[PDB]
Write a protein that binds this ligand. Structure first.
Ligand SMILES: O=C(N[C@H](C(=O)O)c1ccc2c(c1)CCO2)c1ncnc2[nH]ccc12
Length: 164
């Protein structure tokens, strides 16, 4: 049900799209959220996905943290996808704006290998402060399962394709 994606490798595909609109159209088994360790979904991809769920993602996430404590940077958890997907895989990439180690970006993408197919953003890009060209290279060199990457910004999408 994914359509309009450019093939980068055997298993990695990319499109200039809003991940919320893509999730509402496709209703994938797994949508990846660019989470933080507290699952506080304020801005970027996380804020946008949570708003689309009418805040149900944040209510579920607060119950998960009250039971389990915070995630690790490079870690993940599987929660409901609400009206966007069967499941949401909340993955914590390092936030360079908060001083976190960029080497944890490969550990963050390894979480994707537990799922056959995923709709995802580029981890640690955008407001997390890492170079998106580096994030796409770590994705293609780490993930072995089928990943459909949605890049919201048109100008960044064009730069990622021409420099790949
Ligand atoms: O990475 C950028 N955008 C992506 C995207 O468009 O999907 C994006 C945006 C938000 C976000 C994530 C990724 C993951 C956490 O929230 C981006 N766009 C515009 N100017 C920029 N300068 C440096 C990077 C950058």
């Amino acid at each position: 049900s994914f359509s309009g994606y450019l093939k980068l490798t055997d298993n990695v595909y990319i499109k200039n799209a809003d991940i919320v609109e893509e999730a509402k159209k496709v209703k994938p088994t797994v949508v990846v959220n660019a989470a933080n360790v507290y699952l506080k979904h304020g801005g970027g991809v996380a804020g946008a996905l949570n708003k689309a769920t009418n805040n149900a993602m944040q209510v579920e996430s607060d119950d998960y943290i009250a039971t389990n404590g915070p995630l690790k940077v490079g870690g993940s958890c599987v929660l409901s996808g609400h009206n966007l997907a069967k499941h949401c895989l909340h993955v914590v990439g390092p936030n360079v704006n908060k001083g976190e180690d960029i080497q944890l970006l490969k550990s963050a993408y390894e979480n994707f290998n537990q799922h056959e197919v995923l709709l995802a953003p580029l981890l640690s890009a955008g407001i997390f402060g890492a170079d998106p060209i580096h994030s796409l290279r770590v994705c293609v060199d780490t993930v072995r399962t089928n990943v459909y990457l949605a890049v919201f910004d048109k100008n960044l999408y064009d730069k990622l394709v021409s420099s790949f």
